[PDB]
Amino acid sequence: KGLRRDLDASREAKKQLEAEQQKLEEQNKISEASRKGLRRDLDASREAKKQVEKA
C-alpha cells in the first residue's frame, strides 16, 4: 500500500526528520566509542575489516 510519490512530493519534509535522528546517534555513541584513544577496540583493523584498500 501507499503508492503516492509525485502529487504529495515529500523531499524537504524527509530531510528535516532524518537530520535529527542521525545527529542524536553520533552524540550518544561518542564517535564510534572513543574511551581510551589508541588501544585495542579503536585501532583494531580498518573499520572492522571494511576500508582494507592499501592494507
Curated annotation (Swiss-Prot):
C repeats: 1-21, 22-55
Source superkingdom: Bacteria
Subcellular location: Secreted, Cell wall
Similarity comment text for this entry: Belongs to the M protein family.
Function: This protein is one of the different antigenic serotypes of protein M. Protein M is closely associated with virulence of the bacterium and can render the organism resistant to phagocytosis.
Name of this protein: M protein, serotype 5
Organism: Streptococcus pyogenes serotype M5
Underlying gene: emm5
